[PDB]
Amino acid sequence: MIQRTPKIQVYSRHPAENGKSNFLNCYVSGFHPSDIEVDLLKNGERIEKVEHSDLSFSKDWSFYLLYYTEFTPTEKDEYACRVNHVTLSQPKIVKWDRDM
Amino acid sequence: GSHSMRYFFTSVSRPGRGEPRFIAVGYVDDTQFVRFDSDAASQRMEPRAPWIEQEGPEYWDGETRKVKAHSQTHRVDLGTLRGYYNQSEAGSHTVQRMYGCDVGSDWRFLRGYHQYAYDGKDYIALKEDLRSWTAADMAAQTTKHKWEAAHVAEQLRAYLEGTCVEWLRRYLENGKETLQRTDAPKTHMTHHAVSDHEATLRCWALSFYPAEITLTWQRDGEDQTQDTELVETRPAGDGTFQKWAAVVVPSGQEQRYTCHVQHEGLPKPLTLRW
Amino acid sequence: RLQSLQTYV
Incomplete structure (x- = not known):
């Protein structure tokens, strides 16, 4: 049985601009099996009201999911995506980079 | 340009936590238009794009019954594949199915496909001529001969070259302001x-x-x-x-x-x- | 539109 680790990208729907509402995305892809846990973080604490894509998979059969929520960026706050999967011994945290 | 209609089936077994979970989604190019979750309260096929909503009640009742029927078949499959490989009932396993048709710029039939996976690895898939089977191991050979006696490829080809191109054309027209931008x-x-x-x-x-x-x-x-x-x-x-x-x-x-x-x-x- | 045929592995 093959097991694959999720790739994680954290980014905004539109170019980030302080004080203007945007959408924070965290995209999980290329993982197997389907079971996964994804949380969006507002300065280390779990954000509420986060929705996610319907489960699907790519040509190589590995799954992808989009987790997203509406937020309003500032300059001091830190945003991150916390991912837990069977291939990870421990939840992985990927910080949001404004440029990426 | 080119266009495609594809369907994706997933079923994850959960020993000790009830029946396996079935998730199905349908795509038109990179636009998802329906979904079914066997764990949801809906218990119904659901729209996920605006242009599919105009389909009448006969459409949604028919898609619900079949996705419910495919749900249960993929439940049985997890037991059948568990036997094919002499695996124990304790572990969780994955089964995936994908099929669809491709059409060119003139919207005429270009390509068909029907594939099947177990635990993320290739298992059986319809060949490009839609008349033959590619089996991955010796367990998929049993499935291959099983489906050859049931004339499965012949019945899949009739759909992939007919129904699937025509309903993909219908979606493409009905959602021209979104699907064709x-x-x-x-x-x-x-x-x-x-x-x-x-x-x-x-x-x-x-x-x-x-x-x-x-x-x-x-x-x-x-x-x-x-x-x-x-x-x-x-x-x-x-x-x-x-x-x-x-x-x-x-x-x-x-x-x-x-x-x-x-x-x-x-x-x-x-x-x-x- | 889904295909109606039910297949068993």
Whole structure:
């Protein structure tokens, strides 16, 4: 049985601009099996009201999911995506980079 | 350009926690239009795009019954495959099915496919002629002969070359203002020096549809894929997609490198410089 | 539109 680790990208729907509402995305892809846990973080604490894509998979059969929520960026706050999967011994945290 | 209608089936067994979970989704190009979750309260096929909503009640009742029937068959399959491999009832296993049709610019039948996977690895798949089977191991050989006696490929080909092209054409017309638009990407370039004498040239492509795109980094006008970083195309969440490509270079020499954008919504492929 | 045929591995 093959097991694959999720790739994680954290980014905004539109170019980030302080004080203007945007959408924070965290995209999980290329993982197997389907079971996964994804949380969006507002300065280390779990954000509420986060929705996610319907489960699907790519040509190589590995799954992808989009987790997203509406937020309003500032300059001091830190945003991150916390991912837990069977291939990870421990939840992985990927910080949001404004440029990426 | 070209278009596609594809369906995806997933069923995850959960020993000790009830029946297996079945999830099904349907796509038109890179636009999802239906979904079914066997664990939801709906217990019904659901719209996920605006243009599919106009289909009447006979449509939604029929799609619910069959996705319910395919639900249960893939439940049995997890037991059958467990027997084929002499696996124990304790572990969780995955079964996946994908099928669909492709049509060209004239919307005439171009390609069909019907595939099946167990635990993320190829198991059985319909060949390109839609008359023969590709089996991965000796357990899929049992399935192959089982489906040859049941004339399964012949009944799949009739659907993939008929029903699937015609209902894909119907969707394409009924959703022309969304499914037939072509969002040209918006391109800019970031700069983020790494190290004294090396610095990143990241080529950005934003807000394009469909998802297919090609980004390439060149040296003097000729490509160099030595220091090129390339992320997977990702959804922006509003129906469009994003992608970037990066490279490192020696400093003061940043303007021998060009980036080339290929997209269907671009009449001209774009070149960018700094 | 889904295909109606039910198949068993």
